[PDB]
């Protein structure tokens, strides 16, 4: 039931592309009539105020999507109560014939497996976790624990959490046996890089989240178009331009995306403009990619514009190392950018220690420098001044 998971989230993160919200809306109302879930459809509507371009009219005037009703009402209870309490008491009645006769070790475990998975269709909180553990104690093998893991794994799009999803599964994932399990690689590497998206490390996700072993997605975790989108977006930030031609295009997953889905537009824009080191063409593709990728993005849509402004100069910052002396108005006039706005973004990157280079405006003599020197060489000791003594003088009060 991955379609119910994605359509209950993506609708919130899209303030643009009305057609994109219709797929995240019209595909909800159709499925909720089939499912039993009252509360988890209502929790989507609970977040309204302080947003941009929602699908509902309550406080605000917008509702720009083609589907104007996301609200939860009592009209759903017509088809909800039919399969809600009928199948719960029916499947639980079979359990009465299990523990009494003690038939097999599978039937006692498979019963709650057919429940905990069906409780997700009922939309119950404690039933999808606590009661699911009844089959977890009956089956000690890691093979049958996948259904217990996938139930909590799909809660990332249900409860909308990047933290407690893996925290409850941390002891279940690790255990003892690891080995060369292939299906475990797709489950661990997918959610691992998601937690690092808030910390913005991105380095540990380059060889795990960005690099996917499976050419086609894992279904209930993420999407085929989604897993291929995050590889290009994050890969350009972490992997250098040399690794772009040695990895991204090297992987066969990209060759299948080029000849099928061109809607990403980042394969013929961000990849070519960076490889050719052309800033003139790279500028207009920022918003075109931002509109069709970063805005519909389900993760990095929260912090976006700041992430773009950093990589915006990095394309020009690398080109600066190639040329020694360059004027201000020579090639910058043909790039389609304004001189005033170019200095504003660069002027705010000085306190971030992101500029060792030579940038000038009133004159326009622009040179490059060598960030590797004996200054930043000694900076490692200064950064550790307050961080090394934090726990040394802390616990040394009563003890020692």
């Amino acid at each position: 039931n991955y379609e119910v998971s994605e359509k209950a989230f993506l609708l919130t993160q899209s303030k643009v592309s009305i057609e994109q919200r219709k797929e995240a809306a019209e595909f909800v109302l159709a499925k909720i009539k089939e499912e039993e879930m009252a509360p988890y459809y209502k929790y989507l509507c609970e977040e309204y105020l302080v947003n941009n371009g929602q699908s509902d009219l309550e406080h605000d005037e917008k509702s720009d999507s083609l589907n104007e009703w996301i609200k939860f009402d009592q009209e759903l209870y017509n088809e909800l109560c039919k399969k809600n309490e009928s199948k719960i008491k029916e499947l639980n009645e079979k359990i009465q014939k299990l523990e009494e006769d003690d038939e097999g070790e599978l039937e006692q475990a498979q019963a709650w497996i057919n429940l905990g998975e069906y409780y997700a269709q009922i939309g119950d909180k404690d039933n999808a976790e606590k009661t699911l553990g009844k089959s977890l104690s009956k089956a000690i093998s890691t093979g049958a624990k996948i259904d217990v893991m996938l139930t909590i794994a799909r809660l990332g799009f249900f409860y909308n959490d990047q933290l407690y999803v893996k925290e409850k599964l941390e002891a279940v994932n690790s255990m003892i046996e690891k080995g060369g399990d292939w299906e475990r690689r797709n489950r661990y590497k997918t959610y691992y890089g998601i937690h690092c998206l808030a910390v913005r490390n991105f380095k540990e996700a380059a060889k795990l989240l960005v690099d996917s072993l499976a050419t086609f997605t894992s279904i209930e975790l993420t999407s085929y178009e989604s897993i291929a989108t995050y590889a290009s977006v994050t890969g350009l930030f972490t992997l250098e331009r040399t690794d772009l031609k040695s990895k991204v295009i090297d992987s066969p997953e990209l060759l299948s995306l080029i000849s099928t889905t061109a809607a990403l537009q980042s394969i013929s824009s961000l990849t070519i403009s960076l490889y050719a080191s052309d800033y003139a063409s790279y500028f207009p593709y920022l918003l075109e990619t931002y509109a069709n990728v970063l805005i519909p993005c389900k993760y990095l849509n929260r912090h976006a514009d700041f992430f773009v402004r950093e990589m915006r100069r990095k394309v020009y910052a690398q080109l600066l190392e190639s040329y020694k002396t360059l004027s201000l108005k020579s090639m910058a006039s043909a790039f389609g950018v304004s001189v005033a706005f170019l200095d504003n973004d660069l002027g705010k990157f000085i306190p971030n220690k992101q500029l060792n280079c030579v940038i000038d405006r009133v004159n326009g003599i622009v040179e490059t420098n060598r960030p590797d020197n004996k200054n930043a060489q000694y900076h490692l000791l200064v950064k550790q001044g307050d961080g090394l003594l934090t726990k040394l003088q802390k616990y040394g009060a009563a003890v020692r």
Binding site: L286, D305, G336, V337, S338
Partner: peptide, 27 residues
Amino acid sequence: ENWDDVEVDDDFTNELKAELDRYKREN
């Protein structure tokens, strides 16, 4: 997250389209 992360001026959309229109009108 420092102030640069929570800043979010939302000025990247308007400044990009404006600079593209200025260069095309200088022809």
